[PDB]
Design a protein around this ligand. Structure first.
Ligand SMILES: Nc1ncnc2c1ncn2[C@@H]1O[C@H](COP(=O)(O)OP(=O)(O)O)[C@@H](O)[C@H]1O
Ligand SMILES: Nc1ncnc2c1ncn2[C@@H]1O[C@H](COP(=O)(O)OP(=O)(O)O)[C@@H](O)[C@H]1O
Ligand SMILES: [Mg+2]
Ligand SMILES: [Mg+2]
Lengths: 300, 536, 526
């Protein structure tokens, strides 16, 4: 149920992120234009232009005082969001990541001192925001790493990452090891998202299958697939109550699932091109998802 | 493609040397037609119909799209000359290109580039020494008229050249007005403190030199008075809006009765601040931040002038001129929130003047410091922009003449004298550096030649006469007064330029020579080019 | 690949030499020829097609040139000088274009004869100085307190426009509006007709019904029908702040735990609205005008005190109302004062014109802002009438600031040309030829007037020049209607000195700017 549209991007929308105040939606696009428009009135609060193009990594700090972005530039930078109205946002750039391959995705921690970068070099890296130096690397996937999601509720000092390595692996910053590994998707891994409880996580793959893994059993729980859907999902998310499995697909539409049942509860569409991102608002009342159709419409 | 195995092109030796010389010659030839009083302006259509009419070499080279690296070297050379001197931007490019051309001509005769570079360095050093020793005039002897003549000479070839009798007076008055002294007694003239406002309309003769400061701003509300007889200017670096709690502060209401009081305080804070600022006695309030409606209403009821979104540099200049103090917060060392009368600037008048359907603020006769501003009137926007560029060049020239009290004769006199002296001097330095210094001297003659050519006159005859005059001056001890003989482009005959009042700052010639020599050496240092193919 | 090597980027053309000068002069001449036939009392209207789909029937040169898109940069310079002339003095837009074209056309002749442009420019500047001197010499003073002279000057300004048919009404409207807007404060005279002289075009009716109000008019209606639409002597209170309940600047959240807190919060919202309305009522006004919305409860509380409210009015309209009725716009009603209450409006009328409600604050005593009500055939006719009224008001302001007049109908052009020609006889250098060229190029105005009138150009110009060679004949020009030589002391066509000075200055300076130009370079990006 689309309620508003956001036409502020010159090229296709690649990724976006929410805020704890539900009014600071940030995003990245193919051109390199990042806008932090308000969620309700659809007005650009403030915007910045990335010097490079093809940026699909963008995260929003839980406190709201900074944003991170990056793309095919092998770079991840932090843009502080201090008020400082009489300033150009390009001056406060903070280069952080020293990557040898394009940055697939970056995210903050609950504390705004660490960022985790998933890149095509096959390694996930942890960077200290303040000091700017590398904390520790995560050797692992023998191929590109695409998705990266932090656990909620203390994070367990753990995060999951997946890519074209055909598997999703859970790490642990306290020891830097792949504590758990799941290899059951028969296709490329695109997106991953923890369950609200934190002990489970779903993952979308190019085989148009959504799979739910329970960490308390180390086995897949529920298969989410239909013969009608043949285009792989690009994004996936959970409802606030944990009963719905909002997932973005390349079939120009959005498929809605039930966590308990998965009996095709509903479906929605509207986008004219591939859906690239799909995030649920923190309040849980509504949600949003961008697409390659140059628009980032919002559903309520 | 050969055994080198590099993904790109490669030019070596004479091919790349000729390419670099050709690129430098192209850059020189673009601006060669805009040198001297008989030079002409240029249009620069900006691919979307934007028109720029200019004679300034730095502007022409900055606006152009340049791809060859040596052509770039010349373009940034012009930009550096403009930044560090402000005049001679065309001359330095022309001289550098001619130096490079003659150096390459020498190199093609199997003269090693190192010898040419050594000769060029020796020639530049000796030229600077000769200029400083024999071709300078102390401006203290000529008085103020020297400044007027220097400004008029600088404004020739510009759109304000014919009006020099008036524009030179205006420039000199402004520069003398913005003069201030620092420790150790050094008098420095901070140009760029002369705000220049462009507004089409009346003729050039109707341009005004403000005895104060001019703001490109208006009053925030129509209800305020638009003139103050005795201004008490207060400068603020903060906005006057409804105060809101910062990011680390939240308002949580459990007893609903407190909401009204909180909402009242939310604007009463700003009201109290404005009340303090008005109670100190202020009449005009200038701020770099915004002002919303209720604060404007307070200023309206107080019978004061309030201006918002004032530029930071403009605010700094106004504060320096009027003696005001910039305030970012109303906080003292006692932890309280007070505004004092000791930090109020004063001026004799503040007027909402109207200039060609648009209005602006005039702050006239600021006390405790003298300030100047110029409002230029022209036929249209392009002509006003060209007037501004010419005016800036004149201001820079006057500043150079005042800071360094030495001037040199213009109209190619220095170039001809240097050519003769260096040609004579080359005979006693080495064997191939002889040729290098001779070519340096010959290359220095490109300036009078271009001047004569631009006037559609016999360049060869005029330059020969100038060289004969300067040779006689250097040979005969009693004819040393012929050093000032330059070129009279109006009549196409040699003329004593010192008597004619054609002067340039010595720094212009010295810096142009040094920069041209360095650029020529840098370009001549290349004998091989590798251009890797782009990976896009 | 081995891509080609080149100094400047591709698509970077460059022209130079005599071709550039000839092209610039030809572009200026073409721009002049576009509107050459729009000068004089017998000018023909031109019909322009707006890219957005509108139609612009106009005779003013500036409108025609600003509706035209050109590619040659010299044409752009000509359009810019036309805009400059329109902004600076208000009329003379099609005269300056013709003059500049003629001066450039006569300068081309000397450029082709091995004369450097600097010599031509010096001669042009000397000629301009002498034109200024002669124009100041042949001017005459005018008593600004004489209404008949003011009306005659405005008439001479609008005889060439489409409003010439109702010239009398147009002159009265323009003079009254300009005299009404004129204001002085803190020893600063001010005539701001672009802000406090509003022109409102309501299609329909008859143009003879159009009149200037002693007040203001807005397209507004009462928020509530119960409010009075006719108040005799209203006390007006103006606001620019909402009379609603809005959130604060800071982020504020309520935490409700008791049952009555919700109802208490709603009741206090209502009480806050009531307190604002009571603060407004304390001054006992009759109408309240706000730039921002008024809540329904606020409307109820205002109607309780028999107060008419107007909800959302633009900033400029509110400023005009404040000037007309002597009020002062305030933001916080708790700080409202008696002095801020606007008394001076002699009537507030809200009547329906066609199918729309219009609010009248007319009948003001000593108003400083006026609304010119225009009624006519349609939108285009009314737009042209508005343009002519703007020209008339600009001329009135110019005469008020500069009370000097010069003869019209080409008499000033011929007088200045003869003076310049006589002065040139002393000149002996090569500069005399372009000097005389500009002198006789100034004759294009009477020549164009005669061409538009339809009479024989050669014999009329010859006879006019012969007449001007006499002693006391500086006021002899031509009729734009009968094509005969007459005396402007008898015909009565006079023009402000400021307009002519600006026209000559702009023309000569445009000629100088385009003469200085050579070596056009194009194609480079930003
Ligand atoms: N009135 C004059 N008579 C003769 N030569 C002049 C006159 N005014 C300036 N010149 C000469 O013209 C040369 C070109 O100066 P110009 O090109 O305007 O400076 P820039 O190179 O900064 O543009 C200067 O070297 C100066 O000596
Ligand atoms: N009754 C008249 N007889 C002759 N000439 C007139 C008469 N009225 C106006 N003019 C001339 O017509 C010109 C005004 O034409 P107009 O269309 O207003 O040109 P612009 O738009 O440049 O002011 C003036 O130069 C004036 O001398
Ligand atoms: Mg110069
Ligand atoms: Mg007219």
């Amino acid at each position: 149920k689309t309620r508003r549209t956001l036409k502020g991007h010159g090229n296709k929308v690649l990724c976006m992120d929410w805020c704890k105040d539900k009014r600071r939606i940030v995003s990245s696009s193919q051109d390199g234009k990042v806008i932090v428009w308000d969620s309700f009135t659809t007005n650009k609060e403030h915007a910045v232009t990335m010097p490079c193009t093809w940026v699909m990594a963008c995260a929003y700090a839980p406190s709201g005082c900074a944003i991170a972005c990056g793309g095919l530039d092998n770079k991840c930078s932090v843009y502080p969001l201090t008020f400082d109205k009489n300033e150009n946002m390009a001056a406060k750039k903070k280069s952080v990541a020293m990557h040898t391959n394009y940055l697939s995705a970056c995210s903050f921690t609950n504390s705004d001192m660490q960022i985790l970068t998933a890149s095509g070099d096959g390694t996930c890296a942890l960077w200290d925001v303040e000091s700017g130096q590398l904390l520790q690397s995560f050797h692992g996937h023998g191929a590109d790493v695409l998705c990266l999601d932090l656990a909620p509720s203390e994070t367990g000092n753990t995060f999951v990452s997946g890519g074209c390595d055909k598997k999703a692996m859970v790490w642990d910053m306290r020891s830097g090891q792949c504590v758990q590994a799941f290899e059951t998707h028969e296709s490329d891994i695109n997106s991953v998202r923890y369950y609200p409880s934190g002990d489970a996580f779903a993952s979308g793959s190019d085989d148009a299958t959504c799979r739910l893994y329970d960490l308390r059993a180390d086995r897949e729980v529920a298969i989410y697939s239909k013969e009608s859907i043949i285009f792989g999902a690009s994004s996936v998310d959970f409802s606030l109550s944990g009963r719905l499995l909002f997932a973005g697909y390349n079939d120009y539409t959005i498929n809605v699932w039930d966590v308990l049942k998965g009996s095709r509860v509903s479906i929605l569409f509207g986008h004219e091109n591939r859906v690239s991102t799909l995030r649920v608002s923190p309040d849980g009342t509504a949600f949003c998802s961008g697409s390659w159709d140059h628009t980032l419409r919002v559903w309520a | 493609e050969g055994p080198l195995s590099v993904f790109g092109d490669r030019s070596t030796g004479e091919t790349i040397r000729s390419q670099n010389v050709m690129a430098a010659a192209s850059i020189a030839n673009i601006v060669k037609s805009s040198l001297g009083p008989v030079g002409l302006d240029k249009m620069l259509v900006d691919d979307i119909g934007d028109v720029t009419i200019t004679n300034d070499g730095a502007t022409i080279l900055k606006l152009l799209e340049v791809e060859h690296p040596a052509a770039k070297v010349l373009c940034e050379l012009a930009d550096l000359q403009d930044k560090e001197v402000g005049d001679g931007t065309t001359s330095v490019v022309i001289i550098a290109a001619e130096l490079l051309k003659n150096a390459d001509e020498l190199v093609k005769q199997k003269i090693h580039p190192t010898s040419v570079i050594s000769g060029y360095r020796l020639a530049c050093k000796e030229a600077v020494r000769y200029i400083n020793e024999n071709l300078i005039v102390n401006t203290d002897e000529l008085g103020r008229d020297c400044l007027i003549n220097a400004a008029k000479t600088s404004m020739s070839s510009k759109i304000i050249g014919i009006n020099g009798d008036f524009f030179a007076n205006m420039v000199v008055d402004a520069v003398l007005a913005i003069k201030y002294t620092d420790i150790r007694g050094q008098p420095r003239y901070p140009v760029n403190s002369v705000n220049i406002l462009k507004a089409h309309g009346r003729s050039q003769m109707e341009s005004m030199l403000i005895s104060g400061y001019a703001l490109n701003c208006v009053v925030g509300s129509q209800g305020m008075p638009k003139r103050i007889v005795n201004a008490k200017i207060a400068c603020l670096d903060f906005s006057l809006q409804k105060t809101k709690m910062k990011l680390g502060v939240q308002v949580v209401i459990t007893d609903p009765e407190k909401l009204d009081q909180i909402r009242q305080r939310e604007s009463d804070i700003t009201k109290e601040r404005i009340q303090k600022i008005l109670a100190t006695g202020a009449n005009v309030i200038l701020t770099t931040g915004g002002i919303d409606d209720m604060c404007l209403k307070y200023f309206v009821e107080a019978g004061a002038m309030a201006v918002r979104r004032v530029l930071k540099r403009d605010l700094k200049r106004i504060a320096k001129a009027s003696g005001a103090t910039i305030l970012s917060t109303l906080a003292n060392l006692e932890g309280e929130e007070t505004f004092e009368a000791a930090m109020l600037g004063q001026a004799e008048e503040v007027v909402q003047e109207r200039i060609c359907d648009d209005e602006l603020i005039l702050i006239k006769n600021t006390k405790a410091r003298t300030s100047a501003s110029i409002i230029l009137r022209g036929a249209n926007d392009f002509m006003c922009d060209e007037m501004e560029r010419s005016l800036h060049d004149a201001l820079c020239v006057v500043k150079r003449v005042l800071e360094s009290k030495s001037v040199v004769p213009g109209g190619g006199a220095v170039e001809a004298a240097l050519s003769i002296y260096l040609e004579n001097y080359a005979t006693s330095m080495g064997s191939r550096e002889q040729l290098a210094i001779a070519e340096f001297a010959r290359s220095l003659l490109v300036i009078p030649n271009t001047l004569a050519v631009n006037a559609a006159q016999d360049s060869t005859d005029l330059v020969a006469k100038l060289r004969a005059f300067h040779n006689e001056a250097q040979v005969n001890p009693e004819r040393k007064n012929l050093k000032w003989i330059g070129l009279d482009l109006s009549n196409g005959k040699p003329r004593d330029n010192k008597q004619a009042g054609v002067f340039e700052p010595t720094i212009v010639k010295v810096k142009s020579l040094k920069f041209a020599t360095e650029a020529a050496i840098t370009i001549l240092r290349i004998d091989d080019l590798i251009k890797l193919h782009p990976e896009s | 690949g081995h891509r080609p090597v080149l100094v400047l980027s591709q698509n970077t053309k460059r022209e130079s030499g005599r071709k550039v000068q000839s092209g610039n002069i030809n572009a200026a001449k073409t721009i002049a020829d576009i509107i050459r036939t729009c000068l004089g009392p017998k000018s023909m209207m031109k019909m322009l097609l707006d890219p957005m789909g509108g139609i612009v029937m106009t005779n003013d040169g500036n409108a025609i040139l600003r509706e035209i898109q050109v590619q040659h940069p010299a044409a752009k310079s000509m359009i810019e000088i036309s805009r400059t002339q329109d902004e600076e003095v208000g009329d003379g837009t099609t005269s300056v274009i013709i003059l500049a074209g003629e001066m450039l056309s006569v300068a081309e002749h000397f450029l082709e004869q091995q004369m450097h442009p600097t010599v031509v420019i010096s001669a042009y500047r000397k000629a301009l100085d002498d034109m200024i001197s002669t124009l100041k010499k042949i001017s005459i003073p005018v008593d600004i307190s004489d209404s008949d002279m003011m009306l005659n000057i405005i008439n001479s300004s609008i005889t060439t426009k489409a409003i010439s048919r109702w010239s009398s009404l147009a002159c009265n409207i323009a003079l009254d509006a300009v005299k009404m807007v004129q204001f002085e404060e803190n020893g600063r005279k001010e005539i701001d007709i672009k802000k406090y002289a509003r022109v409102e075009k309501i299609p329909g009716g008859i143009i003879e019904d159009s009149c200037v109000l002693r007040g203001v008019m807005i397209n507004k209606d009462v928020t509530h029908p119960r409010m009075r639409r006719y108040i005799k002597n209203p006390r007006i209170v103006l606001l620019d702040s909402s009379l609603e309940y809005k959130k604060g600047e800071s982020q504020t959240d309520i935490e409700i735990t008791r049952e009555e807190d919700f109802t208490r919060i709603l009741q206090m919202e209502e009480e806050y609205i009531q307190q604002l309305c009571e603060d407004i009522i304390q001054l006992k006004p009759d109408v309240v005008i706000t730039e921002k919305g008024i809540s329904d409860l606020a409307q109820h509380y205002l109607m309780r005190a028999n107060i008419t409210a107007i909800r959302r009015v633009r900033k400029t309209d509110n400023n005009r109302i404040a000037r007309a009725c002597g009020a002062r716009i305030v933001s916080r009603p708790e700080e409202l004062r008696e002095d801020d209450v606007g008394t001076g409006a002699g009537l507030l009328e809200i009547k329906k014109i066609g199918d729309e409600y219009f609010t009248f604050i007319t009948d003001c005593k000593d108003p400083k802002a006026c609304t010119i009500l225009l009624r006519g055939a349609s939108k285009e006719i009314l737009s042209e009438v508005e343009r002519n009224l703007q020209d008339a008001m600009q001329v009135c302001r110019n005469v008020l600031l500069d009370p000097q007049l010069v003869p019209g109908g080409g008499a000033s052009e011929m007088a200045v040309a003869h003076a310049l020609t006589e002065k040139s006889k002393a000149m002996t250098g090569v500069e005399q030829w372009p000097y005389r060229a500009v002198a006789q190029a100034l004759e294009v105005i009477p020549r164009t007037l005669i061409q538009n009138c339809g009479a024989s150009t050669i014999r009329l110009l010859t006879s006019l020049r012969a007449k001007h060679t006499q002693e006391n004949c500086e006021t002899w020009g031509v009729n734009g209607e009968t094509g005969t030589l007459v005396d402007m002391k008898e015909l009565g066509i006079w023009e402000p000195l400021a307009v002519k000075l600006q026209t000559y200055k702009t023309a000569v300076e445009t000629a100088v700017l385009l003469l200085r130009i050579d070596d056009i370079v194009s194609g480079h990006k930003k």
